Design a protein around this ligand. Structure first.
Ligand SMILES: *[C@@H]1O[C@H](CO)[C@@H](O[C@@H]2O[C@H](CO)[C@@H](O[C@@H]3O[C@H](CO[C@H]4O[C@H](CO[C@H]5O[C@H](CO)[C@@H](O)[C@H](O)[C@@H]5O)[C@@H](O)[C@H](O[C@H]5O[C@H](CO)[C@@H](O)[C@H](O)[C@@H]5O)[C@@H]4O)[C@@H](O)[C@H](O[C@H]4O[C@H](CO)[C@@H](O)[C@H](O)[C@@H]4O)[C@@H]3O)[C@H](O)[C@H]2NC(C)=O)[C@H](O)[C@H]1NC(C)=O
Ligand SMILES: *[C@@H]1O[C@H](CO)[C@@H](O[C@@H]2O[C@H](CO)[C@@H](O[C@@H]3O[C@H](CO[C@H]4O[C@H](CO[C@H]5O[C@H](CO)[C@@H](O)[C@H](O)[C@@H]5O)[C@@H](O)[C@H](O[C@H]5O[C@H](CO)[C@@H](O)[C@H](O)[C@@H]5O)[C@@H]4O)[C@@H](O)[C@H](O)[C@@H]3O)[C@H](O)[C@H]2NC(C)=O)[C@H](O)[C@H]1NC(C)=O
Ligand SMILES: *[C@@H]1O[C@H](CO)[C@@H](O[C@@H]2O[C@H](CO)[C@@H](O[C@@H]3O[C@H](CO[C@H]4O[C@H](CO)[C@@H](O)[C@H](O)[C@@H]4O)[C@@H](O)[C@H](O[C@H]4O[C@H](CO)[C@@H](O)[C@H](O)[C@@H]4O)[C@@H]3O)[C@H](O)[C@H]2NC(C)=O)[C@H](O)[C@H]1NC(C)=O
Ligand SMILES: *[C@@H]1O[C@H](CO)[C@@H](O[C@@H]2O[C@H](CO)[C@@H](O[C@@H]3O[C@H](CO)[C@@H](O)[C@H](O[C@H]4O[C@H](CO)[C@@H](O)[C@H](O)[C@@H]4O)[C@@H]3O)[C@H](O)[C@H]2NC(C)=O)[C@H](O)[C@H]1NC(C)=O
Ligand SMILES: *[C@@H]1O[C@H](CO)[C@@H](O[C@@H]2O[C@H](CO)[C@@H](O)[C@H](O)[C@H]2NC(C)=O)[C@H](O)[C@H]1NC(C)=O
Ligand code: NAG
Ligand code: NAG
Ligand code: BGC
Ligand code: CA
Ligand code: CA
Ligand code: CA
Ligand code: CA
Ligand code: CA
Ligand code: CA
Ligand code: CA
Ligand code: CA
Ligand code: CA
Ligand code: CA
Ligand code: CA
Ligand code: CA
Ligand code: CA
Ligand code: CA
Ligand code: CA
Ligand code: CA
Ligand code: CA
Ligand code: CA
Ligand code: CA
Ligand code: CA
Length: 863
């Protein structure tokens, strides 16, 4: 009936090497108990050599409660259990399963004598960096009880101890704004050591730190021009004393089988150059070079806030086929993000080439829209039996692979090639399916676009010469994203970088974070507004007041000093603006040439940010600020009206976006003028045969706007359209991801002629929140989901839908179906320690307050 399913620290999935000495604690519940609320909890904290302490709190809080013990030291592990007591004095949990928590290296001094090292091999000039192998042998000549490896790279790393891979993180440490914040990783390497002689080997690649990043050719050596390694191995002996094995000038270095490995262009691997045993003792290191120190400020080093990038899944080969010209092509059945794993035998010195693409065009793999990203891997065989390979420091976005040079010796099939799905390994929380198979597939496609683009940072796309942390895209998508996966730690980290970048950009937000573009970009609405909107949404989703406070300064400085204003406080009308980017009527070559005025759009979003900032101020008990922004919002609402709304309530541009924004942002001077505008919006949509008419500014809000005004049936009609432009067009064209453009592929199969065309962008997938909140009915009634609204709006000829969301408290869900107006049936699951408001469908539909449990509703003759 009731248990604790998960005990977690901050927003970490697991807590090894964390940055917090007083980490907050949360527990999720499992069980079908009715109307249950917590009155108290106990946290057991065990430190080696000490009796456990038990700390009791009279509290209903089960999310982000205080660390109850003395602060943890660097490298100090505690073991924790929790139990929770019910308010009725009748249902209490057993003790949770035990979990551990341990801070990392919290100060520069905690790194002991570890320094960043580089090879004595000269770095390449005006060229990609060949990966460097670094190695060290050491002795553990005392009995030991535990060991840790603390490691990062100026680049990306893969570490081995005695030829065993250290951990399961890939593309490590990921992409931070490295000049401000540089993540390092912590691993428990106790079981990889042996008594006596040991070896550590680490391969370092260029990654984002020094690789070629950016479009229009990009730039390399952005953060530095030399591959570097920082490493500290700490072994705790039986007597509690420690051995320290630092990175320093005693290490040796060499090139190895990786010839090149680049984010965009791919990896060239020559297996003939493998040096077997290099990560083990007794190795012949003849010909290896020395190493030297690189100056580096350890003040930037940080623990991750969120989960690492991992090889999350395999995806099997679906088909092998011949192209129009007889080339061999793999089809994985899904446009995925990661790389291949091969198992193959063939002639020594024969090279296999793998060219990865999202789509086919004109009977061949389509590389054209990748621009200056080759997405091509080369593997040269050794003929020394069956070889297994995956690339190390690249990734690709693809469904198809053209394969040249595959050896006759090995059949090309599901036993010799598979796809590896790679992304930030967040906990899955949100699920949706319904009776309409196309809309169910749309949700799957949104899920896959999220997976492809939550890759250390929230990327615009994963395939071409871009993959940057575009601010506007995540602003539009995060309401959707934060339901599908637990994004809290991931976005916490990103938003720290956003703030650092902003503080060196005159309080404006760079277009992409991390910022590769310098200080020349002028402030923009929607994109710049991410520094308000993403925090606001994060708080709605996870309820973390500490994180809202850390994000406050970015939001406030943006409104106060970042936005460039005209004389009455609206946007300066000489500024560049993205605004309603990729309006389906914009020309393919000029995606910003929208049907809605860029300043009408911008000013709407200025009002929205001001409103969000007022509300955040109120949440944080900043009264002066809250009143100030409330005042500014009212004055600027008048200026918005003067600029963009005629006296009779007509918008300057009567377009889907031009109407949807002032409707959602409540910018009309009267409820009557707003209601009239809502009916005109529905009429414009109907006259457009229900085809979508919004770009990035309008799309994420369009369904919510229509539902806000009781026009869900109109949106259902849009959602069911299968002709371009629409969501399901992309589905019926065999899309398995959401596309950048409504028409990234044209109906005869040709790719959009625009130079900027991707088949894997989450922005259009912002419709997912409407599936979750309106078809599925689920939304937070209090930030963090301790109070839930359950307001299913059936329509669109759906017969049933099932939606699930793993709240911070436990599972919430709806399952509804129709039969027998109609008879409506709903099963609603409400987790322990929460309450919900169930709003049953139809005119005068009953509203019902409920507590935890499984609730069944049967509504006969719904009109
Ligand atoms: C930031 O926080 C603010 C404040 O919480 C929030 O704005 C509110 O959003 C809620 C919905 O979530 C709105 O509540 C709805 O209000 C409907 C009635 O609206 C009319 O009356 C409102 C109240 O007027 C009194 O109180 C205000 C405040 O003290 C005072 O100024 C007035 O003088 C008066 O004393 C009034 O605020 C509102 O005015 C807005 O809209 C008009 C019309 O377009 C616009 O001209 C204004 O400029 C202004 O933006 C309007 O006059 C009510 O019918 C509705 O009830 C339905 O829905 C609820 C739940 O949604 C159901 O429970 C119910 O059964 C009904 O179906 C609902 O209560 C509220 O009006 C907003 N308040 C304000 C001041 O804007 C923002 O959304 C937050 N921002 C973000 C980004 O989240
Ligand atoms: C596969 O299908 C392709 C798509 O159907 C097809 O290419 C099409 O071929 C037809 C017949 O020749 C052309 O039809 C002619 O179009 C012109 C009007 O063209 C102008 O308007 C269209 C539509 O614009 C609106 O819709 C788009 C989104 O659909 C918005 O981006 C846009 O802003 C408008 O709202 C537009 O696509 C055209 O733009 C292309 O062509 C111009 C030059 O004309 C370029 O400058 C531009 O970069 C772009 O390539 C153009 O602005 C009309 O007057 C004639 O009466 C006739 O209707 C289509 O234009 C053409 N489409 C494209 C994209 O080329 C391929 O031939 C076919 N391939 C195969 C192998 O079968
Ligand atoms: C209520 O909301 C408003 C609007 O969001 C906030 O107004 C901003 O307030 C800050 C100060 O808190 C202002 O920033 C200061 O601006 C001065 C220059 O102002 C002129 O030029 C700008 C830019 O072109 C115009 O926007 C402005 O109207 C003026 O014509 C600077 O001199 C100040 O710098 C000095 O103080 C700062 C500390 O803030 C130091 O760091 C500097 O070293 C220097 O000594 C400062 O930058 C900002 O201009 C205001 N914006 C607008 C749009 O009016 C309120 O702060 C807010 N109030 C509350 C309580 O929330
Ligand atoms: C805070 O912001 C300021 C302003 O942007 C910033 O200072 C700037 O830093 C950049 C480096 O990011 C400097 O840009 C260099 O400029 C020189 C010529 O002056 C160029 O040669 C460089 O380009 C070459 O080298 C690059 C790196 O290897 C390659 O990627 C590139 O392809 C070229 O080969 C580079 O553009 C810039 O000069 C300063 N500007 C000013 C006005 O100081 C500062 O770094 C920011 N602070 C932090 C902590 O980030
Ligand atoms: C959207 O509305 C704006 C504002 O009314 C239109 O822009 C005006 O167009 C007229 C006639 O061409 C010009 O005289 C004004 O100078 C324009 N004002 C501004 C603020 O630009 C605009 O044409 C409409 N359509 C679009 C796509 O913006
Ligand atoms: C009145 O509404 C019409 C649309 O019916 C619109 O074109 C016009 O701009 C409006 N005039 C005024 C003064 O509000
Ligand atoms: C979609 O797949 C079907 C086969 O399942 C094929 O007939 C059709 O041509 C495909 N459409 C596109 C746009 O590739
Ligand atoms: O070219 C600019 C665009 O690049 C895209 O990939 C991003 O999705 C947009 O945010 C951005 O405006
Ligand atoms: Ca259990
Ligand atoms: Ca359960
Ligand atoms: Ca109770
Ligand atoms: Ca004690
Ligand atoms: Ca709490
Ligand atoms: Ca010994
Ligand atoms: Ca362990
Ligand atoms: Ca080569
Ligand atoms: Ca060999
Ligand atoms: Ca399938
Ligand atoms: Ca590897
Ligand atoms: Ca097969
Ligand atoms: Ca400024
Ligand atoms: Ca135009
Ligand atoms: Ca208003
Ligand atoms: Ca309002
Ligand atoms: Ca053409
Ligand atoms: Ca609220
Ligand atoms: Ca409602
Ligand atoms: Ca969580």
């Amino acid at each position: 009936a009731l248990s604790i399913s998960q005990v977690a620290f901050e927003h970490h999935r697991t807590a090894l090497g964390i940055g917090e000495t007083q980490p907050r604690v949360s527990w999720r519940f499992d069980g079908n108990v009715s109307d249950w609320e917590q009155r108290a909890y106990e946290i057991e904290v065990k430190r080696a050599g000490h009796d456990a302490d038990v700390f009791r709190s009279e509290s209903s809080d089960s999310v982000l409660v205080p660390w109850p013990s003395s602060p943890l030291q660097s490298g100090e592990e505690a073991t924790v259990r929790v139990r929770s007591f019910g308010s009725d004095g009748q249902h209490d949990t057993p003790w949770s399963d035990a979990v551990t928590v341990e801070p990392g290296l919290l100060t520069p001094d905690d790194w002991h004598d570890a320094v960043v090292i580089a090879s004595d091999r000269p770095t390449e000039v005006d060229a990609t960096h060949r990966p460097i192998q670094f190695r060290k042998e050491f002795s553990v000549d005392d009995s030991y009880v535990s060991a840790r490896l603390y490691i990062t790279a100026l680049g990306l790393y893969e570490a081995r101890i005695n030829d065993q891979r250290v951990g399961d993180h890939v593309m490590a440490p990921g992409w931070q704004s490295y000049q401000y914040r540089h993540e390092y990783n912590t691993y428990d390497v106790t079981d990889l050591l042996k008594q006596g002689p040991n070896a550590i080997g680490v391969t370092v690649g260029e990654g984002w730190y020094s690789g070629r990043i950016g479009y229009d050719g990009g730039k390399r050596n952005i953060y530095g021009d030399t591959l570097g390694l920082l490493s500290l191995l700490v072994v705790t002996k039986s007597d509690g004393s420690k051995l320290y094995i630092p990175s320093d000038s005693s290490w040796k270095s060499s090139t190895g089988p990786i010839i090149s490995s680049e984010i965009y262009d791919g990896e060239e691997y020559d297996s003939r150059l493998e040096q077997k045993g290099w990560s083990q003792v007794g190795f012949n290191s003849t010909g290896w070079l020395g190493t030297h120190e690189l100056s580096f400020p350890k003040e930037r080093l940080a623990s991750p806030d969120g989960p690492p990038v991992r090889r999350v899944a395999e995806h099997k080969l679906a088909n092998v086929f011949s192209s129009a010209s007889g080339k061999t092509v793999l089809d994985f059945g899904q446009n995925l993000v990661g790389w291949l794993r091969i198992r193959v035998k063939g002639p020594k010195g024969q090279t296999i080439r793998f060219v990865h693409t999202e789509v086919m065009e004109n009977g061949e793999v389509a590389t054209r829209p990748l621009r200056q990203a080759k997405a091509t891997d080369h593997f040269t065989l050794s003929g020394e039996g069956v070889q297994e390979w995956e690339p190390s420091f690249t990734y690709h976005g693809f469904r198809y692979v053209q394969v040249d040079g595959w050896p006759a010796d090995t059949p090309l099939d599901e036993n010799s090639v598979t796809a590896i799905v790679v992304h930030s390994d967040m906990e899955r929380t949100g699920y949706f399916e319904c009776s309409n198979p196309l809309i169910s597939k749309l949700h799957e496609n949104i899920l896959w676009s999220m997976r492809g683009n939550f890759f250390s940072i929230p990327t615009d796309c994963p395939q071409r010469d871009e993959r940057l942390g575009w601010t506007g895209d995540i602003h539009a998508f995060s309401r959707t994203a934060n339901f599908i996966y637990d994004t809290a730690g991931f976005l916490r980290a990103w938003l720290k970088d956003a703030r650092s970048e902003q503080l060196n950009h005159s309080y404006s937000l760079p277009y992409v974070i991390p910022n590769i573009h310098g200080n020349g970009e002028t402030p923009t609405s929607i994109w710049g507004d991410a520094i308000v909107g993403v925090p606001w949404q994060l708080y709605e989703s996870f309820g973390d007041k500490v994180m809202l406070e850390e994000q406050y300064g970015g939001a406030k400085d943006w409104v106060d000093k970042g936005i460039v204003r005209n004389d009455v406080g609206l946007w300066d009308r000489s500024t560049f603006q993205w605004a309603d980017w990729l309006d389906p009527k914009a020309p393919a070559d000029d995606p910003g040439d929208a049907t809605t005025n860029k300043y009408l759009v911008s000013d709407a979003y200025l009002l929205h940010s001001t409103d969000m900032l007022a509300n955040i101020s109120t949440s944080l008990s900043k009264g002066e600020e809250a009143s100030n922004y409330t005042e500014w919002h009212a004055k600027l609402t008048k200026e918005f009206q003067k600029a963009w709304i005629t006296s009779n309530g007509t918008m300057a541009n009567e377009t889907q976006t031009g109407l949807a924004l002032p409707l959602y942002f409540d910018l009309f001077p009267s409820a009557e003028q707003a209601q009239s505008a809502a009916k005109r919006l529905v009429n414009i949509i109907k006259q457009n045969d229900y085809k979508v008419g919004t770009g990035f500014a309008g799309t994420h809000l369009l369904g919510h706007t229509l539902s806000k005004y009781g026009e869900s049936d109109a949106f259902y009609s849009m959602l069911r359209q299968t002709e371009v432009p629409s969501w399901l067009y992309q589905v019926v064209m065999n899309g398995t991801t959401t596309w950048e453009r409504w028409d990234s592929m044209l109906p005869n199969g040709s790719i959009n002629p625009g130079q900027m065309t991707s088949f894997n962008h989450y922005a259009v997938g912002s419709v997912g929140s409407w599936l979750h909140e309106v078809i599925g009915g689920l939304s937070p009634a209090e930030p963090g989901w301790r109070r839930i609204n359950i307001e299913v709006v059936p329509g669109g000829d759906l017969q049933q839908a099932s939606t699930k969301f793993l709240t911070p408290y436990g599972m919430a869900s709806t399952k509804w179906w129709l039969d027998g107006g109609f008879d409506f049936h709903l099963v609603a699951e409400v987790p322990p320690n929460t309450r919900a408001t169930v709003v049953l469908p139809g005119k005068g539909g009953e509203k019902v307050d409920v507590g935890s449990g499984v609730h069944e509703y049967h509504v006969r003759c719904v009109k």
